[PDB]
Ligand binder design. Structure first.
Ligand SMILES: N/C(=N\CCC[C@H](N)C(=O)O)N[C@@H](CC(=O)O)C(=O)O
Ligand SMILES: N/C(=N\CCC[C@H](N)C(=O)O)N[C@@H](CC(=O)O)C(=O)O
Ligand SMILES: NC(=[NH2+])NCCC[C@H](N)C(=O)O
Ligand SMILES: NC(=[NH2+])NCCC[C@H](N)C(=O)O
Ligand SMILES: O=C(O)/C=C/C(=O)O
Ligand SMILES: [Cl-]
Ligand SMILES: [Cl-]
Ligand SMILES: [Cl-]
Ligand SMILES: [Cl-]
Ligand SMILES: [Cl-]
Lengths: 448, 448, 451, 452
C-alpha cells in the first residue's frame, strides 16, 4: 500500500520519542503563556498541565503506547492528551507549528545532553588524575615518530588527556550558550498576528532570550552541527587515548596490564590480554565523525525555511551523543582498572640514552653553542653504544677528551631519574612542575 | 633517486612558506627572551633581529628564493639568516624544537586569519542589511517544502542570513580565544632544563598564557579542527544563500536580476542570465567540508606526541580559509549587484491565498477555536478560488453566511499587505517588527 | 553500574548483528558438512548439528527465539542455543574455526544477498521511470543549465537521464558483488589451521567463487563493506538529484508536476499547497548514506594487522546504508507512479524564453552561414521578438530578410518548440526519433509490456 | 594604485585556468578529433581542418616547451587554447566551436585525463606489488608473531604478512580496471545538454579518442560526474590499505617491536641520539590517506542535491581529483621505495618468539587429530600451559609422562608439533602461513607480475 509505504518512510516516532520530556515541558510553557495572554482560560490551562503530567507519569511507567499512525512525538502526545482531557487539548495548537515546536524541543534536549556530558568528562578527568597520583613517580619514555625521544613522568602523559578534555569541556560550554535561544513563537516560519509573548516562554524554558528572526528560528540547525563537531573532537581525544592504551597493553611495550574485568583472553594462551574496551573506544570515533558529516551534508544547499529533510537531523545527534557518552564512561572505567608494570618499564629505559638532551643542556649552560653541544653528546653516546654502557658510567676523563667544560657535577645530570628532575620550564615533565599541575587539577576537580 | 623522491614527498616549503610573517615574529620573541635570560648575548640578539627584518623585507619584495633543499619555512629562513649574519643565527634554535615552533607559528597564522574573516563577515552583513533597507517594503512568499506558506518581507528573509552569520562570528570569536595559548617552550615534547621563560614569550606574542602541558603543546591540533569546522558551518550558510539566489534568479521565480558584472549570458538568448558566482559559492561549501574531514581523519587514532602526519594539517587549513574568505566576499559583491522585479513578484502573490492564516488568526481573536477557524477559512477559500478570486474581493454577506463572527473590520486583515502588517510577534515578518530588527542591526554594524 | 556490566553493554553486538542469523546458520552448516567429509567430526555429529540449526532457524522465523546480551553476539547466541538443544555435538562445530573468519564469512554473505535485492529494486525504479516516460511521451519541457532555460527537451529524455544513472549504479553493484564473492572461511583466527579442512568445499557450498588466498587478509579485510557503502552513496546522490528536480517541479513557480494525495501533504486553509515530503526526505536521506561511508573509511584508516575489535563497528553503518538506499529507491518508484504533469501550465510557460533559437541558428549554418554569424543574426532577431512581444515563429519572412537573404519559406518548419525538438538528430539527443530509439532499447531490456 | 572593477573581483573567483591548464593534452586531442569529424561531415573544409590541426600541434609544442602564457583573462584551458589558436591561424579557428559546448568539451577532456591517470596508477601499483613480493622472497624463512588486538596470537611467516598487502592492492587494481571501463564513454556531441540538429558523427569522435561508445543520453553526458566519484573512492580505498601498511611499518620500526630498520635514505635521525631512526615517509603515507578521504567527500557533497543539467558548481570537481591522484601516486611510489630500503632484525625477532606459548594452538590441533573434541583439547592444553607458566618453562620442555596424566592420546610424536618452528611447519590449509602454502602463493605472484 502506497500510504502504508509512505507512512513507514516518513514516521519519526520510532526515534523522536526520546524527546518526550522536552516536548511536555515545551507544551506546558506554551499553555501557561496562552493563559497569561488571554488566549485560553486558566481553567483550560490547569487541565492541559495536569493532563501533560499524567501522560509523563505514564511514559515513565512504560505504560504509554507509542503509535506510528500518529506520526511523531508531538502528535502522539497531543492525540493522547485529547483522549485524556477532551477539547482543551486542541488549544495547544493555538499560535504554534510543529516547525517551531520541534526546534524548541530539540534544543532543550541538546542542552540537557550537553549538561550530562560535562559531568561525564569531569569524571574521566578525575579518573585520570587519580591514576596519575597513584603513579606520580613512574618514568616512561616520551615518543616522537613512535621513537623514544626523552624521559617523562607518567602523570605528565596522563595530564595531556586531562588538558584535551578541558578544551572539549570549553567547547561544550560555548556550544550550550550559543544554542540557548528560544525558537518558539516563530510558528511555521513567519511568526503570528495573535498576541503571544515569546519572552515569557523563553524565560519559562530557561532560554536566554527569544531568537530575533522567525525564518531563522525554524530553518536553523547550527546547534546540531556544533554539538556534532564538539562530540567528534572529543571522540578524537579518546581515539588517541585508545591507540596509546592498546600500545601500552601490548607485550612489545609491556607497560600496562588491564584487569580481567576490562579485557578478554584465551584459555590456551593465558598471558594474552586483549584490551577490547579501548579498541572499541578508538573505533567508535569513526561513527561520531560520520554523524557530523551526515548533518553537514544534509544542510548543504538547502533553500529556506523549513524542509522535511531536517527530519534527518535527529538520529545522527542521538547516535553521536550516545556514543560519546559510552566512550567517556568506558575510558574512565578502564583508567580505574589498569596497573603499570614497573619492573618491565624500568628495565627498558637504560638502553635509549634518554638523558642525552639533559647532557646537551648541561653543556649549553656552560657556554657551549647548542649545535656543538649536540655533536659532542652524539659522539659520547656512540662511545657508550659500542662499549655497551650508559652515559652515567663514562669517566669524567673520557668526556674531557671532547671538551674541557665537563666537570664532576656532570653526574647530577645523567641517568633518567636525574634527567627528569632537571626539567624546569613551565609545563615541563619536571617533578616539581608536574607536582604543581597535579595540585592545580586536584583543586579544580575538587578531588579529596 | 631514493633521496630525490623522499625529499619531494616530505618537503613542506611549497605550502608552509605562507607562514613566514608568523615564523619571524615567533623567532624575534624567542631571541629576545634568550638574550634576556642570558642564553645569548645582546649583540647576538640584535644581529638576529635585524637579519630577520632584512629577510622579511626581501620576502615582501618577492626577491627571496625559497628552497626545496631547505625543507620548510623554518629552515629556509634560518639558513638564509646564517648566510646573512653568520654564527649568531645558529644560536636562535637554543632551547627550541621545530615541534613547538611550528605549532606556535600555525596558531599565530590562525589568529590573524580569524581576525580577517570576522572583518569580511561584517562587510557581508552590511551588504545584506543595506540590500534589505533598499527593498524594505517588498513582499515575497516565505516557503516550506518549496511551497508558498506565508507572505513575508524581503528584509526579513535577508536578516535570516545576517543572523546566521552572527552565530558564525560568535564561533570565530570563541575559537580564537581557545587557540590563543602559547606552545612555545615545550621543545620536542618534554620542556627543557635551560632557564627560558614561557610567560615572557607568550606575552610578547599576544597569547593569553603558556599551555600547561608540553606534550599537549606539541601534540594538539584542536585549534585546526575548531577553525575548519567554523569555516564549514559558515560555508553551509553561504550554500543556502547560494541556493536561494540561483532560485530567485531563475525565470520560474523571476524575483531578482543580477547585473551583467556578476552573471554570464548568451548572444543567441539575451534574456538568459546565469548567476555563476552564487552557483560557485554553493559548490565551494563542499571543499570546506572536505577540508574538515581531512584533518579529523588525520588526528584519529594517532599516538602521542608529535608524528610527521601532523604536517598534513596545513594545506586543508589554507584551502578552507582561502575558500571561505572568497565565498564571503563574492557573496557581498553579488548582494550589491542585484535588482528585484517588483512588478513580477506583485503579480504572483494574489492567487496564493497567503492571507489565509491571517484570516484564521482574525477568527481565533473573535473567539473561534483553532480547528473551527481553519474549517471556516477552508470553506471561504473554496467559494473563492472556484471563481479564481481573492478573499478580500468577497462580500461581508457571503462571509457571514459561514459564521456570524465576521464583521466589517475583517477587510483590514485580508490581502498580503494587510497580512504582513498584522504579524506582531517578536521576530515576525510584521512591518513594525522588521523595522525594529533593521534598526538594531544598523546600530550594531555602525551603518550610516 | 558494575564494570563487568558496563563493559558487557558496551561490547555486546547481538542488538544489531542478530540480523545475520540466516547467513550465520548457512555458514555453520557448510562448515559442519565439510568437517564431517574431512573426518574431523562423525556424520552423526553433522546430522545432529544440521537438524538443530534448522530447528533454531524455524524458532527465529517464528519470533520464538530469545536473543541474549549475556551471549554477546549472533555467533554465540546460536551456538549456545544449539548446545542446549542437541548437547555434545554442538560443541564440535567450533572445530577449526574462529569468530574472526566466521563473522567475515557471514557479513560477506549478507552483503551479496542485500546487493541482489537492491539490483531488483533498481530495475523496478527504472521500469517506473520508463513507464512514466511513455505515458508522457510527447510532453516538452525546458532543459536547464545554471537553472536557466537553455533548450526544449522531451520529458522522456529527462527521465532517461535518471534511468542511465541507475544503470551505472547497477553496474557498480554487479562489480562490487563479484569482488566480494570470495570465501574467508578457514582462515581461523588469522593464520589458518593444521587441521585437514577443505576450503574449496565450503567456498563452493556457500556460492563463493573460490577461497581467499591469504588467511590474514581474509580476517582483516573490510573492502567489500567500503565498496558497497560507496556504491550506495553514489546511488543516493542520483536519487538526491531526482529529489531536488521533483521538489522543484512540484513548486508553483515551476508548476510542472502534481503529486497525488497519497504521496503528499498540504493545508486545509491553502488547498493548493501540496508538499512533496517523500522526495524531500529522499534528498535528505542521501546524507546519512554518505555519513555511513565516511564512518567505515575512518574506521579502517591506520589500523594494524590482522583482526581488531574496532571492526565490530563495520556492521551498523552497512545496515543503515542498505536499509536507507532500499527505501529511497522504493519510495522514488512509488512517487513516479503517483505524479501527473500540468500540461497547460507547461505549454503556457514555454514560448517566452525563445528555446527555438538554437534550432534557427542550426538552420542558418546548414544553409551555409558560418556559426558565429548565425548566432549574431538570431540574437538580433530574438531581440526584435522580445521587443515586439512575440515568438520567432510569428515573425514574417519579410522581417527576417531585413537581417539576411538566406532566410526562405522553409524556415517556418524550424521554429516553435515542437519543430525544435523534431529537428534534433544527433545520437543521444532530445530529438523525437532519437528518444524513440532509446525508449525502445529500455522497453526491450526491462521487458516492459502493456499487459 | 589600480582600482579594480566588480567584474575583475568576480573573474578571480570564477577563473579555473590556474588548475585546469593541466588538461591541455586531453583538450587538444579532443579538439583535433572534433575538427576531423566536422570536415568529414562537411561542416568545415578540409583546408580549414588542416589549418586547425597544424595550429593545435604548434600550440601543444609551445606548451611542452614552456613558451605558452596561460592567461587568467582567458578564463579556462578551453578558451586559452582556442583564442591562442585564433591569434595563430585566424578565421578557421572560429569554426572549432561548431556543434560543441564547453559543457560537453570539459566532460570529454576530464574523462580522457582520468583514463590516463588510472593507467599510470595501475603501473605504479604493480611496481609496489613487485617490491613487496621481492621483500617477501628475500625474507621467505623469517618467522614473526601474528597479532589480534595487537596481542600475539599465532606465529606466522613474514612473507605471508607482506602478501596481505599484495592481495589488498590486487583488489585496488580491480576497482581501477572496473572504474576505467565504466567511464570510457564519450560525452562529446551532447553540446549544452540536448544534442544538436547539425549532421555530426558522435561515433567517429568517440572512436578517435579511444572511448567504447558515445553516451546514450545528452543530459546525462553533461551532468554526470560518477566517473569522478568512483575514481576518488578507488583512490581512498587504496589509500586506506597504504595507511595500514604505514601503521604496520611505523610499529615495526619502533624500539619496542624492534623488527625492522629503515635505511638512512628513508628515515630521519638525531645527532644527540644516533640510534633514533624515525620512519617519516611511512608516517606521511598514513597521514596522506586522510586528504584522499577528504577529496572524495568533497565531490560527494558537491553532487548532492544538484538539479539537472550542467551547473557551475561542477568546476569544483577538478581540484579534488587532481589532489587525490597526485597524493595516491606519491604514497604508492614512496611505499615501494621504503620496501626496497628496509632490513629485518633477525636476532631481535627470534629472541622474543619462544615465551608467548605461540605453539598452544598447534598442540590443540594435535589432540584433535588424535581424536579429542575441540573443548577437551583446549581444556588439556590450557592445563599444560598452566604448568609451564608455573614452572617457568615452555611446552616442549614438558614430559610425555606429565601429559599422559591428562589424556591417554599423548604419544612421543607430540614433540614434532611443539616450539615455534614446528608450529609454523604444521599449518597446512590453503591460504595459511604454512611454508609450503606460502611458497605456492609466492610462485603465483612471481608468475603473475612477471618477476624474473
Ligand atoms: N509538520 C511540519 N513540520 C514537522 C516538524 C517535525 C518533523 N518530524 C521533523 O523532525 O522535522 N510542518 C508543517 C508546517 C509547514 O511546514 O508549513 C507542514 O509540514 O505542513
Ligand atoms: N572475538 C573474536 N572475534 C569477534 C568477531 C565478531 C565481532 N562481534 C565483530 O563484530 O567483529 N575473535 C577472538 C579470537 C582472536 O581475535 O584471537 C578474540 O578476540 O578472542
Ligand atoms: N621534529 C621536527 N623536525 N618536526 C617538524 C615540524 C615541522 C613540520 N614541517 C610540520 O609541518 O609538522
Ligand atoms: N557553459 C559553459 N561555458 N560551461 C563551462 C564548462 C567548463 C567549466 N570551467 C567547468 O570546469 O565546468
Ligand atoms: O552552456 C550552457 O550552460 C548553456 C547553453 C545554452 O544556452 O544552450
Ligand atoms: Cl512576542
Ligand atoms: Cl623582566
Ligand atoms: Cl618557563
Ligand atoms: Cl551522431
Ligand atoms: Cl584447505
Amino acid at each position: 500500500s502506497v500510504t502504508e509505504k509512505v507512512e513507514k518512510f516518513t514516521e519519526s516516532i520510532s526515534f523522536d520519542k526520546v524527546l518526550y520530556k522536552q516536548d511536555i515541558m515545551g507544551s506546558k510553557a506554551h499553555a501557561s503563556m496562552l493563559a497569561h495572554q488571554g488566549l485560553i482560560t486558566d481553567s483550560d490551562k490547569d487541565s492541559i498541565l495536569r493532563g501533560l503530567d499524567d501522560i509523563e507519569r505514564q511514559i515513565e511507567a512504560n505504560k504509554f503506547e507509542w503509535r506510528t499512525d500518529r506520526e511523531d512525538v508531538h502528535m502522539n502526545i497531543e492525540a493522547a492528551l485529547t483522549d485524556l482531557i477532551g477539547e482543551p487539548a486542541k488549544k495547544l495548537h493555538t499560535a504554534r507549528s510543529r516547525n517551531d515546536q520541534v526546534a524548541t524541543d530539540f534544543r532543550l534536549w541538546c542542552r540537557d545532553a550537553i549538561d550530562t556530558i560535562i559531568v561525564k568528562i569531569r569524571n574521566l578527568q578525575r579518573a585520570l588524575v587519580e591514576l596519575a597520583l597513584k603513579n606520580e613517580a613512574l618514568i616512561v619514555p616520551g615518543y616522537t615518530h613512535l621513537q623514544r625521544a626523552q624521559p617523562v613522568l607518567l602523570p605528565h602523559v596522563l595530564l595531556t588527556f586531562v588538558e584535551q578534555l578541558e578544551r572539549d569541556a570549553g567547547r561544550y560550554v560555548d556550544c550550550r550558550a550559543r544554542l540557548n535561544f528560544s525558537p518558539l513563537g516563530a510558528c511555521a516560519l513567519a511568526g503570528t498576528g495573535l498576541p503571544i509573548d515569546r519572552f515569557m516562554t523563553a524565560n519559562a524554558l530557561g532560554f536566554t532570550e527569544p531568537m530575533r528572526n522567525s525564518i531563522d528560528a525554524v530553518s536553523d540547525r547550527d546547534f546540531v552541527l556544533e554539538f556534532l563537531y564538539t562530540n567528534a573532537n572529543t571522540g578524537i581525544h579518546l581515539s588517541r587515548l585508545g591507540e596509546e592504551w592498546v600500545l601500552w597493553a601490548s607485550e612489545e611495550f609491556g607497560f600496562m596490564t588491564p584487569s580481567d574485568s576490562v579485557s578478554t583472553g584465551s584459555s590456551i594462551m593465558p598471558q594474552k590480554k586483549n584490551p577490547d574496551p579501548m579498541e572499541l573506544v578508538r573505533g567508535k570515533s569513526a561513527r561520531v565523525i560520520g554523524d557530523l558529516v551526515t548533518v553537514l551534508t544534509l544542510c548543504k544547499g538547502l533553500p529556506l525555511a523549513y524542509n522535511r529533510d531536517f527530519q534527518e537531523d535527529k538520529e545522527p545527534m542521538f547516535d553521536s551523543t550516545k556514543t560519546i557518552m559510552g566512550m567517556i564512561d568506558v575510558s574512565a572505567e578502564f583508567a580505574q582498572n589498569v596497573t603499570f608494570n614497573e619492573d618491565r618499564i624500568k628495565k627498558s629505559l637504560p638502553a635509549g640514552h634518554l638523558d642525552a638532551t639533559t647532557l646537551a643542556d648541561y653543556l649549553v649552560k656552560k657556554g657551549m653553542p647548542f649545535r656543538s653541544s649536540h655533536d659532542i653528546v652524539g659522539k659520547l653516546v656512540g662511545v657508550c653504544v659500542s662499549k655497551g654502557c650508559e652515559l652515567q658510567n663514562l669517566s669524567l676523563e673520557e668526556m674531557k677528551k671532547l671538551s674541557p667544560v665537563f666537570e664532576e657535577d656532570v653526574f647530577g645530570f645523567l641517568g633518567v631519574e636525574n634527567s627528569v628532575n632537571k626539567f624546569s620550564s613551565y609545563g615541563s615533565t619536571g617533578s616539581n612542575c608536574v607536582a604543581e599541575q597535579l595540585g592545580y587539577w586536584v583543586n579544580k576537580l575538587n578531588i579529596t
